[PDB]
Amino acid sequence: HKLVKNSAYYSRFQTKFKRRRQGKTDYYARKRLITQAKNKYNAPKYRLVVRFTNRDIITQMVTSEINGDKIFAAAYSHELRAYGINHGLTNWAAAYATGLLLARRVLAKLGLDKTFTGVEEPNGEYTLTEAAETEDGERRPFKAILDVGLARTSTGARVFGVMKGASDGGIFIPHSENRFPGYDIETEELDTEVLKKYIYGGHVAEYMETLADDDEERYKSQFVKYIEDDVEADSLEELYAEAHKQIRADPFRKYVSDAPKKSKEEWKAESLKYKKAKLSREERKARVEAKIKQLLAE
Amino acid sequence: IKKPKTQRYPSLKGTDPKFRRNHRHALHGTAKALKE
Amino acid sequence: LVVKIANEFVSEASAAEVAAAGLNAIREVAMRQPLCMSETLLQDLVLYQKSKDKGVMMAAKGLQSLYREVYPEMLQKKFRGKEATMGLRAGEIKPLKFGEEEAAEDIEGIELLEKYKEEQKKKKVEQKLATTTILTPADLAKLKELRQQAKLDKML
Amino acid sequence: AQNPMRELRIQKLVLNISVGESGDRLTRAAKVLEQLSGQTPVYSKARYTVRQFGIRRNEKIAVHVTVRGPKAEEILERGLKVKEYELRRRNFSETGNFGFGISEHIDLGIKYDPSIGIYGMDFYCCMTRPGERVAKRRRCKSRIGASHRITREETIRWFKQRFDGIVR
Amino acid sequence: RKHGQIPLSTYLRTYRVGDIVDIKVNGAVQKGMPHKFYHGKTGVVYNVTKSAVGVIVYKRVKHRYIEKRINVRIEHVKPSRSREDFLRRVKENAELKKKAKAEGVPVQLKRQPAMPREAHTVSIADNKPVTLAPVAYETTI
Amino acid sequence: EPNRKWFTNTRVISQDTLQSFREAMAEKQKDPYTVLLKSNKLPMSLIRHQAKMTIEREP
RNA sequence: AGCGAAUGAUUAGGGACUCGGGGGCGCCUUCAUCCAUUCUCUGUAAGAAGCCCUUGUUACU
RNA sequence: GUCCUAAGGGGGGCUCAUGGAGAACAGAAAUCUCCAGUAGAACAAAAGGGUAAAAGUCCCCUUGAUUUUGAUUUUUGU
RNA sequence: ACGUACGACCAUACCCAGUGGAAAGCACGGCAUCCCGUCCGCUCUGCCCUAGUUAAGCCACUGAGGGCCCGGUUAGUAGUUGGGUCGGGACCAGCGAAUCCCGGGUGUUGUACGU
């Protein structure tokens, strides 16, 4: 007969933050991510926010201000259809391509696009961008810190695929090789060939080969759009290489999303048409009087 | 109780040693800059 | 005997004084012979240090400390402490066994004494011991001092 | 109400054997659970010392195994065949789960090994609806709605429809 | 201040030497607190470090004041609006004096306290005065 | 200071024990040559209307 | 700083009782042992040493 | 005379006390399952302050529980 | 205006019930070869975006809901600072609350990409 949820409990209840009640922000990690040394003053601390959705990847340059965060640059996985990748936009190779695209976009916006060019041919080796031989002198590489959010940082996660994409694009992201999908904990040596296979999406290719050999029905159920648009297991490496070359060529391509298209005012008018509105004070008082009449009848 | 007097240029004693080390070299550099 | 003392003396219905007396007796028996325990029983008895009674707390902490010097493997990783975990990680601490006696082929600190003699010889040049060299009493005192210094370094 | 993602399904089936004593009896009970489920069972220690039960803290006194998928349906069907497809109405919880208990594990179809012995079991079937990942996931964890929560009556009707059982 | 998470804009304030800041001790974090006294006091930043600032306070002892230098973390300090009314005034007065010198007509350069009010006319149309007794007649009822 | 032991009985004794003690102590007073030992520690406190009716019936 | 259901009591009726003690003739006992029961929650600011622009120095960033 | 005067650091995962409803023996109390649960648990202050993707608990590596020099507070040296 | 990502104030945002959701985005979802972690692919991780569904999350609306927040009053009242050769508390000069009640509400907003 205990009533835990009473008026005293509701009055003494102290809510969490809104983005923690929604379960979207880890403020304990976010504090360490956004604090800058006070002797460094107004030096921005750029972070690569990476988030993974069921059908998309969201990769951003984020800076922190006292009243909000600013997006310096942003690249999404669905924009790779303009570069060629129109299948598997949430896999490890698409994560790498999105990270490379974001790195090229932020370097082009900063203007260091020609001074800092990363590794142009992906090899799968643990490398970090260093100081470039500028004619003026030594230019330190542009630095950003990875922010994975609430993702479990296990070995083989695509949060490190986007990391490797930015590191190959030219951003100095401090990182270690032990969470790449070729690392062995016992040996403590990274497998460059397996990492390159994940770069060019060869794990998906050998998956379709294995499925086509053993279980044709499951292959047709899962990889149906690959069959429909006639992309094979052997063509994935060339497709991703051409996509990387096109990304390094034109980082600011525009993609038509094939969704219904209107203007901001037209979408505003449509959303106001499909919008139930709150009752006025007079209407609320009228329904309160109706409830009072019902109570008097009762 | 009168307020104590203050110095226009306070002594850099409790300041961060790294900033003090850089600041003294900056003072020497601007010193030869003024001597030039 | 230890199981009977644990059941009759250290139980949920037992008084605090009865539990403290039983744990003290168990600690005495464990000092005299440590192999009487089971690991689960010892961890259960060490968990009585969280008791609100001071006597039960100090008796359980005495039992835990005794097994820290004697046999830290039965103790939980939370309860081992610093030196026990470092010794178990490095491998110096060995399991205690019934009937096991020391079988040191060389004297304790003889390696340190030989190292000190080699350092003195190297200093003289710049300016096996048990088999051939006669054990001087000054050399034995120096070896004891070196063993004490090595024990202090291992403790640090 | 008839929406095909409101259909009831078995979230899990948990098999429990609380021996009350450690050693060979618990080892053979774990052997029974392992050969039944196909998975390695997990042991459960006592959390406080009870003198009248002959148990103490940290001493292992129980064993259990959680099985999901069609294997859970098969094991539940065998247990219900032992229980002659008949349950008493108290066995259904207010949260939509149910459970029962058998006294001999040889009624499940397991052979009698004389070294192993005879042990009884507790079967607990936890039900769910599609959309429990909302309450089980790490990022954006939320609560299941009242219209989506399973009711004791719905569990009883689902049992009577699928397993043609008699709840009385 | 509620229990739980510290707001994160405390870490995003940029601190320089010479700034005027006050000390509000945050009970949640124990590292970097000043003494019990020097809480709620306002002083001048003389040293800025990676995660803390040095504040000059003037304590009183007997019949004199002693300068004190304290190292307090950024989590317990807050910018003080004591000189906000001076900085806004100096910027406003500087630009106003520049505009007045450009135009030719001199303006008021000093803030003036509350002067007595001037003469004005109050009309009794639609605001006819009501007569009040020392005690309200409704109250007497 | 408030305490629970202010509101408890401090000395209790049973019927048979009190009766036996009184009978034995009376037998001890019967002899004038027998005196108690440690009498200060003994419970010796246990050992140690016609006009009104007429006035009530007739004032 | 101290108090504390981490407390203060109750135990008639029920047992275990047996050498706990003791008595009588190994056997019963008479007390007594306990257990089972229960009750009690005051700081700072209000400028010419101040503000703004330009310009260097640095091993700091 | 014996015994106690307390294991810290980094990272990761998970929520505690308790209540309701259920499962052969199993009941007031053994293990298992769901829901509710702002801390009512735990952290070596028994009713002080502070902590919930942690400052609690568990797991993996570790001894920043290391040398050296000034400054500040409690106020000549500590 | 509506979503998504990162956010600032951190209940006007929380908790309990119902009702609805164009477009896209979400989400539930499907499959365990590889990376990875479990008593259990439950969680985590990998692959699919095809199918199904707005059932739940999420958003919006509703409630003489609990709570929370903001105004009037309470009240120039309580209280407090000085004055009198004032009485046996009231005046003079001034500062000046919060309850109780009467009501209202039930989130604003930055950056970037889209519908």
Swiss-Prot record, chain A:
The record's annotation in InterPro entries points to:
Rbsml_uL18_euk (IPR005485), Ribosomal_uL18_C_euk (IPR025607)
Subcellular location(s) per record: Cytoplasm
UniProt-listed Pfam families: Ribosomal_L18_c, Ribosomal_L5e
- Asked whether the keyword RNA-binding is assigned, the reply is no
For molecular function, the Gene Ontology terms on record are: 5S rRNA binding; structural constituent of ribosome
Quaternary arrangement and interactors, per the entry? Component of a hexameric 5S RNP precursor complex, composed of 5S RNA, RRS1, RPF2, RPL5, RPL11 and SYO1; this complex acts as a precursor for ribosome assembly.
Q: What does this protein do?
A: Component of the ribosome, a large ribonucleoprotein complex responsible for the synthesis of proteins in the cell. The small ribosomal subunit (SSU) binds messenger RNAs (mRNAs) and translates the encoded message by selecting cognate aminoacyl-transfer RNA (tRNA) molecules. The large subunit (LSU) contains the ribosomal catalytic site termed the peptidyl transferase center (PTC), which catalyzes the formation of peptide bonds, thereby polymerizing the amino acids delivered by tRNAs into a polypeptide chain.
Q: What is this protein called?
A: Large ribosomal subunit protein uL18
Swiss-Prot record, chain C:
Q: Which domain of life is it from?
A: Eukaryota
Location in or out of the cell: Nucleus, Nucleolus
Q: Which residues form the signal peptide?
A: none
Function of this protein?
A: Required for 60S pre-ribosomal subunits export to the cytoplasm. May also be required for 60S ribosomal subunit maturation and accumulation.
Subunit organization: Associated with the 60S pre-ribosomal particles.
So what family is this one in?
Belongs to the SDA1 family.
Q: What is this protein called?
A: Protein SDA1
Annotated organism of origin: Chaetomium thermophilum (strain DSM 1495 / CBS 144.50 / IMI 039719) (Thermochaetoides thermophila)
Q: Which gene encodes it?
A: SDA1
UniProtKB/Swiss-Prot annotation, chain D:
- Which Pfam families does this chain map to? Ribosomal_L5 (PF00281), Ribosomal_L5_C (PF00673)
A GO CC annotation given for this chain: ribosome
Alphabetically, the GO molecular function entries are:
structural constituent of ribosome
Database matches in Gene3D superfamilies: 3.30.1440.10
Q: Which GO terms describe its biological process?
A: translation
Q: Which UniProt keywords apply?
A: Ribonucleoprotein, Ribosomal protein
Please describe what this protein does: Component of the ribosome, a large ribonucleoprotein complex responsible for the synthesis of proteins in the cell. The small ribosomal subunit (SSU) binds messenger RNAs (mRNAs) and translates the encoded message by selecting cognate aminoacyl-transfer RNA (tRNA) molecules. The large subunit (LSU) contains the ribosomal catalytic site termed the peptidyl transferase center (PTC), which catalyzes the formation of peptide bonds, thereby polymerizing the amino acids delivered by tRNAs into a polypeptide chain.
Q: What is this protein called?
A: Large ribosomal subunit protein uL5
Q: Which organism is it from?
A: Chaetomium thermophilum (strain DSM 1495 / CBS 144.50 / IMI 039719)
